[PDB]
Amino acid sequence: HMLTNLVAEPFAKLEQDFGGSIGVYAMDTGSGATVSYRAEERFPLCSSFKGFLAAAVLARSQQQAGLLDTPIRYGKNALVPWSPISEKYLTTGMTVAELSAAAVQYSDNAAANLLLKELGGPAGLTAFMRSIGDTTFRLDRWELELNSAIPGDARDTSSPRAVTESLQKLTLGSALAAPQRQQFVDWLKGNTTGNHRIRAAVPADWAVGDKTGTCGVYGTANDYAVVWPTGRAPIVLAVYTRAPNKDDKHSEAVIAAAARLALEGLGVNG
Numbered sequence: 001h002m003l004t005n006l007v008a009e010p011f012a013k014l015e016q017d018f019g020g021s022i023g024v025y026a027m028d029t030g031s032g033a034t035v036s037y038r039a040e041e042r043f044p045l046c047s048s049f050k051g052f053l054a055a056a057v058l059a060r061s062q063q064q065a066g067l068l069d070t071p072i073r074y075g076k077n078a079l080v081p082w083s084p085i086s087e088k089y090l091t092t093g094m095t096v097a098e099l100s101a102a103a104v105q106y107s108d109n110a111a112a113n114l115l116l117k118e119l120g121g122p123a124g125l126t127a128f129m130r131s132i133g134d135t136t137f138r139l140d141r142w143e144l145e146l147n148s149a150i151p152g153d154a155r156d157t158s159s160p161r162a163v164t165e166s167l168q169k170l171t172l173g174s175a176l177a178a179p180q181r182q183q184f185v186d187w188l189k190g191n192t193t194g195n196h197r198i199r200a201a202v203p204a205d206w207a208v209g210d211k212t213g214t215c216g217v218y219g220t221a222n223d224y225a226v227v228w229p230t231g232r233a234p235i236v237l238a239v240y241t242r243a244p245n246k247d248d249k250h251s252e253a254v255i256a257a258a259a260r261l262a263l264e265g266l267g268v269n270g
């Protein structure tokens with residue numbers, strides 16, 4: 001409660017300058033201290049579901065040996081906008097692991113949709129999240145229909161708190177077996193799309209993995225991350241934004257600034 005009260009005023013100023021709503025939940029996994037701002041509100045997931053998608057693939061790989069090596073072939077009709085890796089292998093195919101890495105590290109849309117199909121669609125990913133104790137997450141649609149980000153629409157949303165809680169379980173807790181857990185961490189650490197978001201608030205000598213999302217309407221974009229400061233326990237945090245008007249633009253700088261405030265609220269110098 002004390003740290004949440006500590007950052008309420010700066011968060012309100014930040015979201016008023018942004019012109020929308022900012023949702024943050026940050027957890028110090030050492031002390032258990034947390035910072036919350038709109039942490040229970042629903043925000044569109046956008047591409048941030050793709051991280052949980054790769055975790056679901058890894059969970060299944062614990063039950064099905066060789067799943068990660070399975071080649072997947074696809075047609076030109078799979079190549080929806082922003083498929084930067086999968087479009088280069090259209091004439092060849094890619095493995096499940098390569099699709100997962102592309103979905104996490106390049107936010108590749110075709111890769112995400114192909115893996116969603118393997119897992120039974122949006123309801124299958126939602127079922128995985130329920131299995132780890134997340135009752136908030138819901139995926140309803142595919143890329144790119146899930147970007148609609150309609151105000152008040154619960155489809156394809158979660159809350160910052162639920163995102164952080166599930167991310168902790170999958171990267172630091174026991175939701176995945178140790179080898180799969182480290183693979184998930186390694187994919188997040190290799191993400192290329194988040195340099196202007198949470199990472200922009202993280203000192204160079206701290207390890208960080210993240211997954212971004214950008215819906216492109218209603219000022220809606222996000223990032224979640226696990227941060228390993230040196231000499232203390234890791235921090236898990238989620239930063240989500242939205243705004244009232246369809247033509248409102250998202251802001252990467254606002255996401256980075258919100259991450260800075262969350263870390264400052266936890267007393268993590270850096």
Ligand SMILES: Cc1cc(C)c2c(CP(=O)(O)O)cc(=O)oc2c1
Pocket residue numbers: 078113114117121142143
């Ligand atoms: C690779 C892929 C992509 C999509 C979008 C789907 C869909 C949704 P649609 O294409 O019907 O709009 C359902 C499905 O079952 O498989 C997919 C596989």
Ligand SMILES: Cc1cc(C)c2c(CP(=O)(O)O)cc(=O)oc2c1
Pocket residue numbers: 056059060119124125127128131
């Ligand atoms: C896509 C996916 C993956 C897994 C591991 C599950 C689990 C674990 P399961 O009990 O099936 O072994 C529960 C579930 O309901 O959905 C999933 C969806």
Ligand SMILES: Cc1cc(C)c2c(CP(=O)(O)O)cc(=O)oc2c1
Pocket residue numbers: 046047048081082107108109193212213214215216
């Ligand atoms: C059409 C499109 C698709 C994506 C995946 C993006 C992303 C990557 P994401 O943040 O969703 O992971 C950033 C962006 O600014 O525009 C996009 C536009």
